[PDB]
A paper describes a structure:
We sought to develop a general computational method for de novo designing protein nanoparticles with geometries tailored to present antigens of interest, focusing specifically on the prefusion conformations of the trimeric viral glycoproteins HIV-1 Env (BG505 SOSIP), influenza hemagglutinin (H1 HA), and respiratory syncytial virus (RSV) F (DS-Cav1). In the first step, we de novo designed antigen-tailored trimers, featuring N termini geometrically matched to the C termini of the viral glycoproteins. In the second step, we generated tetrahedral, octahedral, and icosahedral two-component nanoparticles by designing secondary interfaces between a designed trimer (fusion component) and a de novo homo-oligomer (assembly component). This design approach yielded nanoparticles tailored to present 4, 8, or 20 copies of the viral glycoproteins in defined geometries.
We chose to design our antigen-tailored trimers from monomeric repeat proteins composed of rigidly packed 20- to 50-residue tandem repeat units, as their high stability and tunable length (through variation of repeat number) are desirable properties for the design of protein-based nanomaterials. Geometrically compatible docks (non-clashing termini separation distances of 15 Å or less) were subjected to full Rosetta C3-symmetric interface design and filtering, and twenty-three designs were selected for experimental characterization. The proteins exhibited scattering profiles very similar to those computed from the corresponding design models, suggesting similar supramolecular configuration. Crystals were obtained for the two designs 1na0C3_2 and 3ltjC3_1v2. The structures confirmed in both cases that the designed proteins adopt the intended trimeric configurations, and that most of the atomic details at the de novo designed interfaces are recapitulated.
Residue numbers in the entry:
A (entry chain A), C (entry chain C): 1 to 119
B (entry chain B): 1 to 117
The structure:
Amino acid sequence: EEAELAYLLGELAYKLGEYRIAIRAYRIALKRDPNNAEAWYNLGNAYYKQGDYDEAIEYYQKALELDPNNAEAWYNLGNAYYKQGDYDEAIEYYQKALELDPNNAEAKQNLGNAKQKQG
Amino acid sequence: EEAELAYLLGELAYKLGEYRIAIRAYRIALKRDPNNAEAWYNLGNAYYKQGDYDEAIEYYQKALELDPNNAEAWYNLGNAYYKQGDYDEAIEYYQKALELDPNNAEAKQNLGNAKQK
Amino acid sequence: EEAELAYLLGELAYKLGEYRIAIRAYRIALKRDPNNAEAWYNLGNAYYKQGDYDEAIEYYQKALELDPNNAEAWYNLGNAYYKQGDYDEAIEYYQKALELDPNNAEAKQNLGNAKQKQG
């Protein structure tokens, strides 16, 4: 229904790089369905893509409280910490991402980058 | 009104090559308005664009039950059969398309291709 | 809520050059929220982009009754009259546009074009 339409609009907007429109659409989705883990996750991505890492972190966290079994969320949480030079936290979350999804090449590369920093 | 929004979102998604999103949106439109022939037709196109010809066929057929006088639907039904090498069926539907719309070149070209196979 | 969704869809469609979809979406938005000046304005732009200048004019006019302090709207109203050869009206609205936004060099150029077309 309308929340699903809002969600689809946000995804479409996101995929086309219209992050402000994605955010406004995901907000409508979340107003209607506040416990939608995937909407929080995607709102997080939209903020991430705009360089707003603190907001991304907050919404990734919210998504993971609702659904901790989202490997990609753990991974992006890692990235957002990495981009702020919080290498400890990035390492913790990349590792959690890999515990859930050992095949995430990207998380493995970034884990390695983060481990090499820190020092 | 919600059905129209769903439909517009599906068209937008389709036009931009986001077929999965188009399908999900058109399904919401059809849930609200199951007699919308153009939504069935477009759902068909979205599946066609993804290479899922059997599904495309099913939805083209549904669209044509609702609007049998719609030459473009007959034409796309033809194409979907053609892409699966069902040349007999493609010929029947291209011909039906042309019986309704003697112009539209494309169905005429494809009819010729199919007949040659 | 539905009005906002319709509006977001219209914006998204507009930004991507899908003007027919934008028009249909903005119509739904305005049906739900007829006092949205920015929706009237954008419906106007969508019709303008399609070459439907009489419709553009109608919706610009509506937008400006609701928000007269929108300089860019006065300017586009001017353009739409210009494209139909209503040079008097184009001149009046370009002038109004400049009274509100003296830095609109485009409106100044077009004002000059219109003044020339009419002798």
